[PDB]
Structure formats: structure tokens, C-alpha cells
């Protein structure tokens, strides 16, 4: 869903037309579609370095690396490096939708499911994630990187 | 500027002679006469019952008075003709009647306070709305007055009054300052509990309390719609000739 | 239009091409035009219903005549809230400016619906064809042809 | 006749307390925009009888017969009857706009409109196809800036338009 | 009803003529004195309740015959000083929407029309309420040209009693 | 005649009452464009000349035909535009009249009263003076909102001619 | 009705010339000296009706047989017969303040007056008494000294004070 | 932006919808300042390739480091060659609005191709992104903006 | 956890002293603390007025109070108000701790299942949330309103 959609869905269910506060919030939208496709271009500019700098700050030299930790092995490493791109892509996403349900239909359905299944921490993707959203508002501005760490948070809370 | 359409009247009480003097009952009005004075209650009488006429008793109070032309009248400087003139292009008198009136209610309420007749029909009063809209109130009203009507029937020193009501309501109380249509206007039917026990039921309601959708909420506009279609078509089907019906090529 | 980009480049493994995002800034740019277009088309509804209603009525008499469905104060009541759902979701497809909230909510089972229900399909293509005609009038060219644009989506959706 | 600062009384009154803070500092944008407003009538009254005889160029030209023989416009006296009261509307739209709320045109204007207008015979519906195209002209001036000091009356030209649609909403 | 912007508009439409620069030109002037016409408003309406209970008890002081004298009419007994807030307060109401509506409409159209025909059959003195008038226009606080704003209107429901 | 200080007084007459806060709002009002009306006058009398014959010499460039045709109603010979300057002359009094009363009035009462009869008897054709006074709207080189001034005023003669 | 602005106004158009530039100076001084216009104008109407008893106790106490039983002013509707129009030479010369120019109250309180106090019996010369004890009143408000800010109004009370006498010359 | 709406509507039953003829129409309409930055781009093909090769030398000296990939006057002509072919693929995308001549000319299998030249990808991204901030520097600010997207999606595209 | 309690634990995970960045983080809450606490207070006021202003901007006269919908039942109608009481409440605390973690913590840690579980609907909690949201907006003033529309747009969110 789009916050277009959403506000389309919730004029609709009532049976009501476009009344003055969903005009509102649709030119609200579309004044700050500017700045929401901008910060999408520059995040896929170069969301490998963002990857990079978020293990390289949260996860490297620790414990989880080391073996016993649940990143040791090599093909848990490409897991992980999957899973935070996963997290960075659909946080786009999210931003340049300006609703988070498709983080809610996408990502976080049966997430924590999993994440209990395979044994992984939680706490350390919470705190990953966090590093993500730290890297990303320094590196697009903190104007979006409000919009962009509302989503990353989200998807924090719900892995939570 | 445009001349008059011509309206058709209808037979009313006035349109017939009713001859004679000394034989209409006790209950025609005093044809009070600023002729006859002889004293001042005969002055006060003539001054009241002409504000009588025209704001309906329950008005006429201290403030919608005005004073100077009954200042004037006992003086005899202007005519009772003249003087229904300064009461009916007053504005006391359109914050009472005409701005809370229509011009086709207008031209049927300043008919029955100055001329003292119903309009005949309802083209009647679609008749002189048209010169309420461009001539303007006081320019309505200064004709009613020059009318040959009013001038034959009353003259130019004599307070109007019902002609010839022999059973009929009386005017000032059979119509109101404003009708129904008008009365959530200036009245205050919306604040009273009394009436909003009445349109609790009323069928106007039921249309206002259905939730969005059913086709009951789009009855009115299907009835403006029409548009409905034609029968089908009278020749039998033993007259088509199907095999030779078709066109080659 | 954001939703038909995301799902676009969702379904790839990339991100959103910038070429998508400059069709984004574009629609955002001409989002007012858009919300102009939809508020003058929802505050003159009823007119709207009454011209198509006429232009219908007087087109296909067999609505009217009583083998056909809107026959009866009812039906044609019914009939005028069909034409007015179409122009609620003709008004929401020009605010979202790509055709997927409309032709959710009323393309993509219509056929057996009007199957099911007796009426004919073609019937509504000419009404919603005469709601295209009353607000080609209604507006001024450059609308109308945004306009028309959505009209003539649903026109082409019910054949 | 109400106004907008005549309204927000007698609602006032009806519920019986004093005027609020927050209507004030809504009439005082009332006031504050009240020159944008006098501006914007004074060009309508202006070209008042120019819009007329603009919208009598398409008011009889899409719809011919109603001039042709057997239409309501056909003679002479029938003609000037909608030219003398094409300019009602523009007579009481102007005082709509002066006064800030329709109160006014309501209650002369339109009240018995409908009415007549099946007793006549007149087409109803003809009217309310170039009401509209009195509107196409009147926002196009009220708009245009011609010698005036640059500024933002957008507000105005939408809830003109306003008045035009309830003008021609009560007579179709 | 009567108001600058009503009264441009009546006197053209008795004429059957257009708004001309000469009822557009009055509404201009209005606008004017509406900017310090609010400032009289909001004036009174924050001190509403220091100014009707100051004036409810100051009519009680030039007239203490009215707290002691057995009468429907006066408000010796509780209901008549429970009715004494009320008729005084709706004063300060109507004071307050001629102020805001810049001309004495509402206030001839709410309080001061039928009014002698009211004070003659209840038998409550005119002089009663110009007391308490007085005393509104004295302590409103009010100062500059809204000071004046107020005191036309007060003194022009004084003119109407007497 | 038609002047805002008059229609605050023949409405207040009329309802035999005393002059309201209402009546003397419009005065108040008056003045503020009474000094931006005044600029407007000087502007039409320093530049009177050159507007009356800018003006006949244009609508003979329009209306060719009217210096051609032999006809007492025409300006065929000099008697013409000696009766041309006269009557647009004409003009430019009545309009720097009614800037300085403020009101329509004595462009009411001298110019536009009674003008369908007139036309219509001697043939003028009302398009001419029509084309004459867009010619000096256009060209009295005014500016600021005495330029709006004039504008109304020679607009609201257009109006009244068609 | 006529005017400051109307009436040089009406004697420009007698001998048909275009108003001088001296004229339009005498005017912007009008227009500069109509906000005291104004001021003088609302303090009169709002101590309108405490001018007209306390002028008129003066009136009936100076000539007492008045309302002593005999005299013009005795009975009851007589004694508001001298309150009913006592006030209108005070409704007449506000109307002439605000206008300026006499022409307004030579037609009301100056054109017949003179005819019906002699034709009705009431003294003629005993209200000229009693409007100069109007103006003793009325000036005294108009440039009393308090609140607004101190100007020059001497001539406008001058002036002021002019229009009481002549309501006083035509009656006696 | 035609082929892709082509294809796209291909993909499904229907014609061209209403937004993509809006889309096309501002695409047009866009399309003369599309090719005022290419030839601005065109003309200064020189100065650019060998400013961002520099500033790529100056961020990233391991390619000219002996053990690197571009050591020596032939290695190092051919990495300002292949800077040189990304410009020029650039310049086609932002004359067509599609990415699709870049991908299917220069991004689809550049990985694996790299990857057997011994070339390390990071330093390619980083030369490209050397040539946005060059033409971002050279053009104008929101011209700027649309070259440096499309040179964004080069970069991302490239790691 | 506070601001003060979050700088600790940064400055603390690192085993880092408090460098000048933190001391700059806890005297601008410092600095902020005197509009926080006069903010909590007339918040704490006037609570009932403002979730009554909230339901009448929002929740009233629509389908949700009318049969069938899920404010019909009168309990329904408390469990509303409670709710609302609850959001306002915690986002007075995550105003006055300056962090907003007491709202992930005890607020919107299982309240999507809770409301998917009972069939709440999520979009009109939204839409109530954001007139709380105006309304103690226009009660507090706009310097307030800005740090109470924060958390009370974390916990709409959240919540979507
Ligand atoms: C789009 C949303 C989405 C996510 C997130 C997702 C995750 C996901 N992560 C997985 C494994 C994994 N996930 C992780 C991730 C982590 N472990 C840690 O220590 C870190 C805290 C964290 C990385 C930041 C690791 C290490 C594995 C490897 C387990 C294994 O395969 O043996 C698996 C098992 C199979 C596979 O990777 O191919 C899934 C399905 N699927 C999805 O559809
Ligand atoms: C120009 C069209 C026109 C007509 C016809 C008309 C009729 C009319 N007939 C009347 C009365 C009357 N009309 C009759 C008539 C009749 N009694 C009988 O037995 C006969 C069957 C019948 C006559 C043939 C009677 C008896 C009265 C007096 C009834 C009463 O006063 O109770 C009255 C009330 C008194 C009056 O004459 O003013 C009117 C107005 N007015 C009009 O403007
Ligand atoms: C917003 C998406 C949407 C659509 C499309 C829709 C169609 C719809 N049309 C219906 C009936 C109807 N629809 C029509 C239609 C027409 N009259 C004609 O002759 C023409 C063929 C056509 C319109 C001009 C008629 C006549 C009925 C009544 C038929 C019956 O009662 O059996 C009904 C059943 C009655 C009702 O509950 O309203 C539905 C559900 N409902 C929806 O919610
Ligand atoms: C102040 C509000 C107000 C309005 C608007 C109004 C209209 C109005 N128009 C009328 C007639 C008319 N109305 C029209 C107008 C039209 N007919 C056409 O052919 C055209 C389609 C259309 C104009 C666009 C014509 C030509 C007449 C004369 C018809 C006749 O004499 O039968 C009449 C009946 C006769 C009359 O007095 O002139 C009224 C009452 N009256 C009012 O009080
Ligand atoms: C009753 C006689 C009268 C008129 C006519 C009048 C108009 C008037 N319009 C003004 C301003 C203005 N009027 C407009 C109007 C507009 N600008 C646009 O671009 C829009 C299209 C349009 C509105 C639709 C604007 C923008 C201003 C700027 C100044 C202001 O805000 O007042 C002002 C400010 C003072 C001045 O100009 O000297 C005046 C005088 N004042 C008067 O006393
Ligand atoms: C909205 C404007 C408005 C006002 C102000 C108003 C006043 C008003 N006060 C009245 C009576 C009254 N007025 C008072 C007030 C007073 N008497 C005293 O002794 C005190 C001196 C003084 C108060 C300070 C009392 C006590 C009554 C009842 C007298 C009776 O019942 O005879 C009455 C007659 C009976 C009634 O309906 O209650 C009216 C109409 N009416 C209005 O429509
Ligand atoms: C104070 C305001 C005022 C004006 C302006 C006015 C004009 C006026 N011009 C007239 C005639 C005339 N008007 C004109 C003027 C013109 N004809 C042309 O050919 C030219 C196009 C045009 C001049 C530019 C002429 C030539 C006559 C004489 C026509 C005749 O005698 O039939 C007449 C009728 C006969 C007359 O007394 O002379 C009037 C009343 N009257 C007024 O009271
Ligand atoms: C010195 C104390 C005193 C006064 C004040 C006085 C006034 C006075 N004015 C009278 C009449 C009148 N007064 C007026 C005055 C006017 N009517 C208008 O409409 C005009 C606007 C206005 C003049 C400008 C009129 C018209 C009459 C009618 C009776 C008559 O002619 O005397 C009469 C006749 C007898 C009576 O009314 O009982 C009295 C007493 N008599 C006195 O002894
Ligand atoms: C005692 C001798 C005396 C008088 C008479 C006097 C009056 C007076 N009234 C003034 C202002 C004013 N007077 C008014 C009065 C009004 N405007 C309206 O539109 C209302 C209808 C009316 C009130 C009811 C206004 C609006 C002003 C504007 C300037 C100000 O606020 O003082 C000023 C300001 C200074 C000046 O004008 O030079 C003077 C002098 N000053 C004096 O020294
Ligand atoms: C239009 C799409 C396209 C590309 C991209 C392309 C690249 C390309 N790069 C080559 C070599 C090369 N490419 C580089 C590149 C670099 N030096 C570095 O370290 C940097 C990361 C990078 C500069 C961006 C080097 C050093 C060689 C020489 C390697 C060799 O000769 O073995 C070659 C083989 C020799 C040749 O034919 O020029 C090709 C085909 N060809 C194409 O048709
Ligand atoms: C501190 C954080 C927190 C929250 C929010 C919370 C919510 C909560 N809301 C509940 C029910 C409910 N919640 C709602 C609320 C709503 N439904 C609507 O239609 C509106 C959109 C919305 C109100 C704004 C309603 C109507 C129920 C009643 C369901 C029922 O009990 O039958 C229940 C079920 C049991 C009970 O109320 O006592 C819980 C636990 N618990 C918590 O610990």
C-alpha cells in the first residue's frame, strides 16, 4: 500500500469523497516526494558501503564472528550480509511509499518465527539495524534520515 | 422597462360591484379618513389602524414607529397615500418582511397590507416578481401605489383595508411576516425540542439516516432522470421472413 | 503510481532504477493539477449523474422499457448509484494517477457481476461514456483530457 | 441577509455564550483579506456587462433553436427577457461575494427559481449550461492581473466559483 | 439586519442597480475600524465576569430599595439576583456582538427593540440598567481608540432606555 | 444625489432614526479613498488636453466611415467635430466629477440618466464613446491605485452605455 | 441634499469649467480635517438624548406658565409633542455636521417651521430660547478635553455653533 | 521510456494506460533539456574522464600501484577507455530516460566479466562515481541532479 | 531508559569516559527539562478533556460508534477511552524521559497482535492517535507540541 492507497482505502470504506483532510495529507505526500526520491537514489547509490560500514561497526570483531558465534561460518556471513541488505531495500521501499505496510506484509510476517528457528540473536540484529539507520542519516541528510530511520526503527520493534 | 406578461386572474370576493351604501353588514372595516378630523383621536385612530395594516398590530411597538411622518400627517403636509409610502419603503419595515421574504412570497404579502387582496394566482405573483428583481423593492411598491387599482378602490386619503371579506379569514392573521420555507431562518426551529420530535419521524429523515449506498438515497434523482423507453414493436413475429431477411454481401 | 514502481523493481532483486524516480518527482510535481481535477469533479456529482442518466436514457431506451433491468423508480435509483460509484472510483483512479485503486475496486470482476445481475454490460460502457461526455464539458481542455484519460480506462474495461 | 461577520453571531446567539478567541482570530483573517476582496468585485462589476452578452455568444449558439422559431428565446421581448435577467445572477453574485456568504442569494435569487421556471415553460436546464460559462469568464477577470499589485486571491477564486455552482445547482 | 456591509447592499438593491464605488467604497471604510473593533471584543469578553458581577452589585448600591422591597419584579429575593446576572449578562453578550459586527444591528435587533413595551408591563425601571451601563463603561480597562469602540455602543443602549 | 456621505444620510432618514455607528463608519471609511480620489482628479485635469484630442482622433481611425458620410448625426464637417470635442469633452468633466464626490452620483444625474433616449432619437450610436473612453483608460498615464481610481469609473460609463 | 464635496460640486457645473487645482486644496484640507468631523459628530449622537431633558427642564423652567395649565406645553401628549421634535432639530443638525453644508437642514427644520408655529399657536419665539441652550450644551461636550488626543476643533465648533443659529433664526 | 511502458503493457492484456501517456508526454516535454546535457556532456568528454581518473588515482592508488591492475601508460589508457565507454553510456540514458541502454550495453554481465580480468568492481564504482561529481560540477544545480542520478545508477549498479 | 540513562549506556558499551559530544547531549536535556516538565504538567491537567476532544474530532459520528461497528457496545466504548488514556499517558513518559523506549518497552511491544487478535481497526487508532495529537498540540503550544507529536507519531508508527 501507498499513503495514497491508504488514504483512498480510508475515504472508501466509509463512502466518503475526497474530503479537505485527505486532500491534505495527498499534498502533503506530494510536497514531500521530492526530497523522499532523492534520498532513494543516493541509499542505492551505494547501499554495499552502507552494509559494509554498518558489520563494520556493530558486528565485526566481536564474538558473533568468532567461532561459536552464529556468524562464523562463512555462509552465515553471506546470510547476514543478505539479511541487512533485505532490511535497507524494503526500508527504501517503505521511505518512497510513505507507509510502512508492506514492511508489515513483506518482511516482518514471520520474521521472529525464523529468527527463533535458526537460532539467531535478535539483540544483534536489533543493534545492526541500528547501525544501518546511523550510517544512512549521516550519509543522506538528517531531513530524510528521519523518514529513514522511522522505518528501520519500525522494523526494529517489530523484530522485538 | 420590459412591459407586464399578461396573467390570467382568477374570480375573487372583490371583482363584483356590491352595490350600495347602507346595506353591507357592521363587520367592513373603518374607511378612516384623513378628511374627516374633527379631533385627535380621530388623528391617533388614523395614524394606528394605518399601522395596522401595515405591520400587522403586534409590531408597530415604540422603536419601528416612525415618528416624524406621524409628525407629519397631523399637519396634513403629506397624503395617507404618501404616508403607507414612507411606511412600506422603510427600512424598519424590510428587516421585518422583506429581506426574510421571497419576491414571489413579497409580492403576495405587500398585496394583502396595501392593496388589501390575495393575488389571484400564482402567475400573478410570477408576474410582478420580475419587477421586485430589477426596479427594486421601493421601486415595486412605488408601483402598487401609482396603480390604477389602488387608486380607483382607496384614493389618496384613505388607510387601506380588506375589500369585501364577506367569508374570508382576515389577511393579517392568515398570513404570516414569513412561511414555512423560510422559518428555520428566521425562526428557531432548530433550537426548540418541539418540532425535532415531528421531523424525527418525518419521511425526510429516513432519507438522512441510510448509510452510503442503497438506491433509496438516488430515488429523488431518478424521478428528475425520465427518459423512459419504448415499448416494443407491434408487428408479429410470423410477419419477419427470416430466410429472405438476410442481405448478401 | 509509487506502488506499481515498488512492486516493479521488487519483484527484480534491484533497487529503484532512477528513471523511476524521476517519473515519481514527475507525478509529485503534477499531484495539485491532480487534486484540482478530482475536487472539481467531486463537488459537481449529481449534475454529473443527472447528464449521464439523460444521455443514457435517451441512447438505450431498454433500461426504460420493462424486459429490461432498471425498470421502476427502484431500479433506476439503483441504476444512478451504479454511475455514481463509477465516478467515485473515476475520482480516486485520477488522484493515485495509474488505474490500480480503480480497477481493484471495479474492473477486475465486473463481467460475471452484470452477468449475474441481469444487466448489460454495454449499457454501462455508454453511461460511463456520457460521464465522460458531461465532464468534458464540465472542465476546461487540458482537464478534460486528464479526465477522459480514466473515463475512457473504465470505458474500455466494461466492453 | 447574512454576512460572514453577521453568521458567526447568530450562531453565536443560538448557543447563547461569548465569541471565542479562535473566531476572532478567524475574522480578523477576514478583515486581513478583506482589500483582496473588494479588488476582486470591483473588476466583476466592471465587466458586467461584458460577461453577458460573452455568454449570450454561447448560450443561444449550442443550443440554436432556442432562438429559431418556437424556441423560449425566439421573439423579441423573450430575448431581452434573458438578457434582463441574465445579470440577476451576475446582480446577486456580486452581492454574495461583497457580503462573503450565500445567505443572501439564497433567499431572493434562487428560492423561487425552480419553480417558475415549469410554470413558464422555460427550459431550466438551458440556464444552468451557460451560468457555467458565465463562470469560465468571471474567474478568468477576477484572475488576470491587469495593473494590480501582484498577490494571492486563489482562495476567493474557489469559493467564487462556488457561488456560481450553487447558482446553477437551484434552477437545474 | 443592519450592518455597513448590509447597508451597501440594501441600497443598491432598492435601486435595481449594481454595487458601485460609492457602496464599495463604505465597505472599505469599515475595515478599518473592524481592525480596532476586535480589539474591543476580546476586551470585554476576558473580563466578562469582573464586569457583570461589578456591575450587578454597583446597581445594588444606588438602589438598595431593590434588595429589600417584597416583588416579582425585584431582586431582593435570590431569584431575582439569580435573574439580575442574567439580564445584565446578556447585556455585555449583545454589547460584544454589535462590536464585532460593526454596526448597532444586533444590538437593535436582540435587545433594545420592544423595549418599552417589556419594561412597562414587568414594571422594571429603565433606570435600573443605565446604573449598571455606566458602570461597564467606566471599568472595561479599555484604552486607545478601542476605549471608544466600546463606548459608542454602551452609550447608544443608554439612548434607547431613556 | 448619489455621494456616500448622502447615502448614509437618506438611510438613516428613511427609518426616522439618528445617525447610527453605522452610518458613521462609511464617513470614517470615505476619506482613505477620498485622498487617493483626489490624485486621481489631478491627474485627468493636468492631462485634459491631451486626452480629449487623443480621444476624437482615435475613434475616427476605428470608424472611418463617420468623417465620410454626409449626415447631420455625422462628423462629416468641421460642424461635427466641433460637436466631437464638445461631447467628449463632456466626458472628462463628468468622470473627474464623480472622482472627487466619490460616488456614482453626478456621473448618474449628468451623463448616463436618460441616454437610451437620447441615442436612439439622433442615431449616435453608442460604439463610438465607447471607443473613445477605452482610449482614455488606457492612456492617462496613471499609476498606483489612482490608476485603479479612474478605472472604475470610466468602466462603470462603459457598463451603462451597453 | 448637498454637500462640502457636492455643493463646489454644483457651482463648478453652472459655469461648466473643470474644478481649479485651488479648489482641490480647499478639498484635501476637507478631507484632512474630516477625521475631527467624525469625533465631534459620534460624541453629540451618543449623549443625543441627555441633551434633549436637560435642555428642555431649562426650557420649561425659564418660561414656567408653558406647562402650567394653560400654556402650549401643558397636557401630556402636548409635552411629547416638545420632546417628539425637540429632538429632531438635534436629528437634522448632526445630519448637517456630518454632511458639512446647511443645505440638509434648510429643508427639514427651516423650510415650513416658521408656517405651522403660527397657524398651531405654540409659541415660536420659545423655542429659539431653548436651542440655544441646546448649543450651550452641545458644545460643550463636543470639544470637551477628554481622552482621543488634543487638536484644534475651534473651527469646527464655530461652525458647529452656526448650525444651531440657524435653527434658531427660522423659527423666531 | 517507450519501450519499457511498451513491454510493460505488453506484459499485460491491455493497451497504453492514461499515466503512461502522461508519463511519455512529460517525457517529450523534458526531452529538449535532455539533449542540451547530453551535448554539454559531449563537448566536455575530455576534461571529465580525465578529472575523474585522477580524483580516482588521488582516492585509490592500488590500481597504479605496481602490483595493480592499471600499471603502466597502456593499463592506465584503457582504465580512462573504460571510464570513457561508462560517459558515454551514461549520456545515452539520459537521452533515452530508460536505463535500459545502460544495463543491456554496459551492466548486465559486468561482474563476472571483471572478475576474470582481475579487475577489482569497487574501483571502477569509484571512478564513476569521480565522473558524477565532475558533471555535477560542470552542468547545471537540478541538471546537475538528473545527470548524478543516472550516474547514481551506474554506481550502485556497478558494486 | 532516559536521555541521561541512553548517553550512559553509549558512552558505557564502549568503556569510554564522557567525552564533550555526551556532556553537549545531557546539558541540552538539561537546557530542555523546564518545557518538559511544564509540558507533563498541564498535559496531566486536563487528560480527560483531551481524549473527549480527540473522540468527538475523530471517532464520533461515525460508522465505528454506530452498530457494527467496534466502538458500538458501551464496554467497547470504555476499552476506547482506555486505550486512548494509555497512549496519551505513555507519551507523557517518553516526553519527560526524553527517550522513546519506554514505548517500545511497554506500549508497542505486543499491541499489533492484540489488535489484529481482537479485530481493532488499526487506521481509525491512527487517526484518533493524530487528533490527540493536534489537540495537545494547540493546548501546550508548538514548542511542546513538537517533542509530544514525536512520540505520539512514534506510537502511530508503530502501531502501522
Ligand atoms: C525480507 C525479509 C527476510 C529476512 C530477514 C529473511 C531471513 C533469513 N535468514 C536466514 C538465515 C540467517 N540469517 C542470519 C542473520 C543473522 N544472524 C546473526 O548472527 C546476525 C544477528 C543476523 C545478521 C544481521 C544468519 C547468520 C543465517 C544463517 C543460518 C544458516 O543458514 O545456517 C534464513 C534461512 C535460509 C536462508 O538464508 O537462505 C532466512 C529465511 N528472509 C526474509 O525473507
Ligand atoms: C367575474 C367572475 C366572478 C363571479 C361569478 C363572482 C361571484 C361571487 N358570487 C358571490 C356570492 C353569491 N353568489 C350567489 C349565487 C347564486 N345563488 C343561487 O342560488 C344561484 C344558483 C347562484 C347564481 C346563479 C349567492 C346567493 C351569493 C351570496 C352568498 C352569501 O353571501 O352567503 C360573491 C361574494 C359576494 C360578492 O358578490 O362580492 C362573489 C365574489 N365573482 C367573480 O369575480
Ligand atoms: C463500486 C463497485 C461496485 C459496482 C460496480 C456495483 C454494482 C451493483 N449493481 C447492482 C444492481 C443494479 N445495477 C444496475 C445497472 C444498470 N442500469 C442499467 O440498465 C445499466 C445496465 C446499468 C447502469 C446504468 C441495475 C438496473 C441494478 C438493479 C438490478 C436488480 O435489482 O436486480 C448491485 C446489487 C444491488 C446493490 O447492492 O447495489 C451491485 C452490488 N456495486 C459496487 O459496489
Ligand atoms: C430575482 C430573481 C428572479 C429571476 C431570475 C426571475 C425570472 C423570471 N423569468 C421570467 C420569464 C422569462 N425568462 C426568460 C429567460 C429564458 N428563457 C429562455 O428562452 C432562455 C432559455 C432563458 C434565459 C437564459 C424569458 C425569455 C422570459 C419571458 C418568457 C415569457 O414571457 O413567457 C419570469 C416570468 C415573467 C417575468 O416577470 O418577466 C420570471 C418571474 N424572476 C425573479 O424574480
Ligand atoms: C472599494 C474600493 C477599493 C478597492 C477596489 C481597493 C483595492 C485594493 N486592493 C489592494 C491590494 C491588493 N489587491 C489584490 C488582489 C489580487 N491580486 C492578484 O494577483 C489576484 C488575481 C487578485 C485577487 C483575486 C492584491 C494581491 C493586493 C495586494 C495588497 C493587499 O494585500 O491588499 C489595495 C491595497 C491598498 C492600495 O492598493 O493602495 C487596495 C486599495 N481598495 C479600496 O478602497
Ligand atoms: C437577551 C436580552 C434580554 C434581557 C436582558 C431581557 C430581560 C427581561 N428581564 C425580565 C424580568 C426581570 N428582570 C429582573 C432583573 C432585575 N430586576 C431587579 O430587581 C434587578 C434590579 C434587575 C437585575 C439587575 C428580574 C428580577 C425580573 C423578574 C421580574 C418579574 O418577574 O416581574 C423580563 C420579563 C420577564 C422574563 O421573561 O423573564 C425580560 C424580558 N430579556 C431579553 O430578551
Ligand atoms: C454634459 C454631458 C452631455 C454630452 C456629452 C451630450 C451629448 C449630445 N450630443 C448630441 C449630438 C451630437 N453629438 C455629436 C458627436 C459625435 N457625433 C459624431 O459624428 C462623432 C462620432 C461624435 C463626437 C466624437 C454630433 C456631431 C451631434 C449632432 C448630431 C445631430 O445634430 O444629429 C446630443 C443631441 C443634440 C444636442 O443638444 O446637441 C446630445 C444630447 N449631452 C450632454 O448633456
Ligand atoms: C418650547 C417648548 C415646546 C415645544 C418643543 C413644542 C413643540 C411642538 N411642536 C408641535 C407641532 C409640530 N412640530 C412639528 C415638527 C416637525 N415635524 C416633522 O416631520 C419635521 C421633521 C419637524 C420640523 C423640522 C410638526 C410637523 C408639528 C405638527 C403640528 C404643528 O404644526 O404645530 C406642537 C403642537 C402642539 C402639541 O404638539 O401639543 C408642539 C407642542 N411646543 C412647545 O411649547
Ligand atoms: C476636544 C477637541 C478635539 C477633537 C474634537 C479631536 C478629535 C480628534 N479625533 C482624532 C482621531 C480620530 N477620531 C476618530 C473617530 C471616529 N472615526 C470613525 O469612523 C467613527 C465613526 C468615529 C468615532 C465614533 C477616529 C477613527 C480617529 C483616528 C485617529 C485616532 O485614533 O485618534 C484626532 C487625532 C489627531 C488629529 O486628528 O489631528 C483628533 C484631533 N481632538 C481634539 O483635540
Ligand atoms: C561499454 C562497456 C564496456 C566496458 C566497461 C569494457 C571494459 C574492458 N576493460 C578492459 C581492460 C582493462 N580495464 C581496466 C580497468 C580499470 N582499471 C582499474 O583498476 C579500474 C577499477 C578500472 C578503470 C575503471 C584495466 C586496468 C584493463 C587492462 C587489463 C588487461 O589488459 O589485462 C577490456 C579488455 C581490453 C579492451 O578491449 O579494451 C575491456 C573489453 N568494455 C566494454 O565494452
Ligand atoms: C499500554 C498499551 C496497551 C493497549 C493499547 C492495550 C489495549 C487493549 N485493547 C483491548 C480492547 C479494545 N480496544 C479497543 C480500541 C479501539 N477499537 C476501536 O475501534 C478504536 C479504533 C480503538 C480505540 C481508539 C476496543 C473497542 C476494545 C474492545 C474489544 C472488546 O473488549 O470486546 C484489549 C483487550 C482486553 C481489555 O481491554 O481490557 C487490550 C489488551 N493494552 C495495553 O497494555
Known sequence: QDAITAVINSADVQGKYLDTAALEKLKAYFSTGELRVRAATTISANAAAIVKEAVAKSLLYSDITRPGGNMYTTRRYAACIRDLDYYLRYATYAMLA????????????????????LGVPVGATVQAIQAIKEVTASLVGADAGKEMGIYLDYISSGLS | ??????????????????????????????????????????????????????????????????????????????????????????????????????????????????????????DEQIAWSIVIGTKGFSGFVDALIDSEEYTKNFGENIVPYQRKRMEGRPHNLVTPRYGEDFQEKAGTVQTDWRFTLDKFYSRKSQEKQLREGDPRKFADLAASVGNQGNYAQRISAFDIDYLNAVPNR | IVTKSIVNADAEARYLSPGELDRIKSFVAGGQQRLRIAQALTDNRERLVKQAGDQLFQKRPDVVSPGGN?????MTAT???????????????????????????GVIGVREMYKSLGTPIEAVGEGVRALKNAASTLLSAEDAAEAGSYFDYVVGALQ | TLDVFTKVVSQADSRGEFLSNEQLDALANVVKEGNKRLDVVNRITSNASAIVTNA????????????????????????????????????????????????????????????????????????????????????????????????????????????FDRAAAAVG | ??????????????????????????????????????????????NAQRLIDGATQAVYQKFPYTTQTPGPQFAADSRGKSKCARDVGHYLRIITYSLVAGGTGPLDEYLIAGLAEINSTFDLSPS??????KHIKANHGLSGQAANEANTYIDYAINALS
Chains 1, 9 share one sequence.
Open chain 3, 70 to 74: 432498471a425498470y421502476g423508480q427502484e
Open chain 5, 1 to 46: 439586519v443592519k450592518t455597513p456591509i448590509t447597508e451597501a447592499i440594501a441600497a443598491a438593491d432598492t435601486q435595481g442597480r449594481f454595487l458601485g464605488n460609492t457602496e464599495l467604497q463604505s465597505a472599505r471604510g469599515r475595515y478599518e475600524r473592524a481592525a480596532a473593533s476586535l480589539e474591543a471584543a476580546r476586551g470585554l469578553t476576558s
Open chain 4, 56 to 163: 449570450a455568444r454561447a448560450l443561444f449558439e449550442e443550443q440554436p433553436q432556442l432562438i429559431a422559431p418556437g424556441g423560449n428565446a425566439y421573439t423579441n421581448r423573450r430575448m431581452a427577457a434573458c438578457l434582463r435577467d441574465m445579470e440577476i445572477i451576475l446582480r446577486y453574485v456580486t452581492y454574495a461575494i461583497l457580503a462573503g456568504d450565500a445567505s443572501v442569494l439564497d433567499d431572493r435569487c434562487l428560492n423561487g427559481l425552480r419553480e417558475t421556471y415549469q410554470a413558464l415553460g422555460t427550459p431550466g436546464s438551458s440556464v444552468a449550461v451557460g451560468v457555467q460559462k458565465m463562470k469560465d469568464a468571471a474567474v478568468g477577470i477576477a484572475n488576470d492581473p491587469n495593473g494590480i499589485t501582484k498577490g494571492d486571491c486563489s482562495q476567493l477564486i474557489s469559493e467564487v466559483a462556488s457561488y
Open chain 5, 128 to 133: 435600573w440598567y443605565v446604573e449598571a451601563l
Open chain 1, 98 to 117: 510513505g507507509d510502512p505496510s508492506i514492511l508489515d506484509e513483506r518482511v516482518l510476517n514471520g520474521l521472529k518465527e525464523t529468527y527463533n528457528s
Open chain 3, 79 to 105: 441504476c444512478l448509484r451504479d454511475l455514481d460509484y463509477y465516478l467515485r472510483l473515476v475520482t480516486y483512479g485520477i488522484v493515485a494517477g495509474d488505474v490500480t485503486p480503480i480497477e481493484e475496486i
Open chain 2, 1 to 122: 422597462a420590459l412591459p407586464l406578461l399578461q396573467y390570467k386572474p382568477s374570480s375573487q370576493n372583490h371583482r363584483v360591484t356590491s352595490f350600495g351604501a347602507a346595506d353591507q353588514n357592521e363587520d367592513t372595516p373603518y374607511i378612516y379618513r384623513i378628511e374627516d378630523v374633527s379631533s385627535y383621536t380621530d388623528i391617533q385612530n388614523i395614524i394606528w389602524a394605518s399601522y395596522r395594516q401595515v405591520f400587522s398590530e403586534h409590531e408597530i411597538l415604540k422603536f419601528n414607529r416612525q415618528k416624524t411622518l406621524e409628525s407629519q400627517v397631523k399637519n396634513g403636509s403629506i397624503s395617507v397615500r404618501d404616508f403607507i409610502r414612507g411606511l412600506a419603503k422603510s427600512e424598519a419595515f424590510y428587516r421585518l418582511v422583506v429581506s426574510v421574504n421571497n419576491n414571489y412570497r413579497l409580492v403576495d404579502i405587500t398585496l394583502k397590507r396595501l392593496l388589501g387582496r390575495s393575488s389571484y394566482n400564482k
